[PDB]
Amino acid sequence: IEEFYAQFGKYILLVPGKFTGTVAAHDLSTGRTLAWLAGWNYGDTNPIMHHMAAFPSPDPYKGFEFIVNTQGGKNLFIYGIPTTVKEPGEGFNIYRVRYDGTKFNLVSNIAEKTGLGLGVHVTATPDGKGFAVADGQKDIFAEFDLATESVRTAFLVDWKPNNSDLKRAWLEGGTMTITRLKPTLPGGKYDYTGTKGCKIDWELVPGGELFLEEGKVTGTRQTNVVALDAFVYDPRGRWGALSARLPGVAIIFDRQDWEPVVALVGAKGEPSSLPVKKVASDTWEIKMDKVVTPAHQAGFSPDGKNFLFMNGVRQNNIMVWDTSNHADPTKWTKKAVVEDPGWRGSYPNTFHMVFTPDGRKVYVTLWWPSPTPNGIAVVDARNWKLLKSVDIGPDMHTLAITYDGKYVVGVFSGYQKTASGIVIMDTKSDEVVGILPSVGGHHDCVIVPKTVEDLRCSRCTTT
Template structure:
């Protein structure tokens, strides 16, 4: 039997395609979402299906979207493509998506590298980078996943802030996103559309002579409709304060505003003020400052309002027993928790159900952390049974993650996940707490998955680039309540 070259090639190609189909199955490695069936790791990681995790690399200058069920990076975006010299992607928050593999939007803040941790490691970076806020979009609808910039919100609004970002929930769901910055002591709230509109902005200033805090609304230029706080304009301090630096700010008016967190059931938000150990509660129906919580143990529940003059609220702050760093609401909204640190290492527990925030009272404290470990970030679970906290420590100490029972306010479990631990965020099914560690921007780094019921570490994956923050993309607006918007 003879066979010509054309017949041979046709037969070989057909056989090869059949063999490839057998090996790869119906979903192959060239699809935008990979099916790892038949791969050795598939059984271990399939439990994480449905979760897409955003991981910004603080030193690497990029953000990646990870599918831990494969595991693989779905897409990544280097912010240098936007023309930023030495970008420092800082904090992140994701909009809800019923199918994050197909697409979702998220927000990213960026700060200049002129911070002490950079000065220690790379002093030549001090004058590089920029303050930025971006609305970003992940698109997984085609054969090639991608992440793109939707809007440079700092350029659109004229205000560039570089610390926490949080998306409104509850009565503020599907409306607003908030940005904050501790070098400028400002908060900006915008709409969530692709061409965002300015909703409200605040600035906080301390008067060290009168011992008073002024929280003021600030307004864009009436002609341009924009602020004049692009880049480094408006900075009080040259860098974001490290833990402990709250005690000796270079600018005596500085208070190191950290974030704006949203109440999950009531129309309130909290401006977190690190230096003074307090949180200004804002009524999001009127954007008035209605209370100033004083979170330290031994301090009153609220600092008193001295006066309101126009769009400025002045509160008496006669003494500061401790700074704070990070605070937020549990998923149910029943409690507001504040991480006091540096002078007091404890977590204040406020009952936050009253519609008058001046009546929110401290009911308990989570304690026992000693002087080495500082409460830092907070993570929620859907049913509010537990809250997770990062206990940060200066190198060469590792720090750890702890689990707190919200009935007894006792620590029930601890994990030394790795050096320089940071944020905690729950998977969409409520079964696992994810947490990242960054090795002080140079050493070991990764993401850990902790089983909420068994307290067992189920998986660990490498994350090079010093992840200072991360977020699991929530599946709904209700799911956003236990994402990183009610707490930071």
């Protein structure tokens, strides 16, 4: 067994636990868990540990830092756990955690310091000195400076539907408005702690994008939701892509002047992009005459020359843009679309991804609801053809890769109530080399990076 682990190399796997309330680092070279922390011990009464990213450390085994965030409110009530809790904790914390070579230290709550409570993807910036967080119930994203724990920028995104009827509010198109946000409380604090700011009272769960149009999700501004998901970074610098699941759009922002420059449109058969028009000193718009399908997971390739966005449910595919023109995102155009006849139903959804460091392949999860086994698609990232699908387990989420390129490491999470695990796949044979047990509902995972170059294949360039 130690022979088993000695193949993997000295890589540390970090995972949040979703409804377990924990975060944990595992030493893939020995099978030992190095450290873990349980949010509830600190008085977080609803620690839905959601997403995270880790910063470059010259020796992760001596120390490393990471951000992990949580959801809260009625997000406790949507995974089927028959809890009698009446008033769930507000959550939406953004925790800075440092491993000191023995234990995790809860260093700070960045959500409490800044007033932005945001509970979906966390991504590191490519120089490892800042991070972004987005939220799909509030439709806000921000980028943060790690050293000062302060907001660099924050934006609200809003939908104005053509047809105010809920079932048609996205299908018949609408106007997306992007507004740069400014702090409203004393001290330069934002007023978005806890559940404050929500358009809907819980998130749109994996594979659940259409649940809002279907009348399944309560809240006060249902038809104004776009479900922001993530801000992923071009590894070349300068640009980030903000995914918005309901319009199926990735808005490219220029991080130099903090403006949106163009809007990629996910659906197959739809234009490569739509323009972003500025309408006010801090406000921009995108007009869409229709929305063919929602989309979710998004990512750049290691060299930044491709960007992927996974259309889901109304279409299940991998949409690929040629992003090789780093100077001009209005040049980025659809170059390929990975499809398969077996993805013609509502599920599976093409899901989380990770590229090999050499950019030659991308691994993409295939998610279904219970009880179909969920899996990993292996895709040739030179000719954009599906090579292989491999079944893994129920409710498969994210993939990380060891930074030598030799093993993909993924998690599945049992819909928070059935089987869960860590899977390791050998990238030479594309076969599963083992399952390790995992007490986790993880929707995320990362391998602690040593360099900035490692972030190109980490929770920086992709979800």
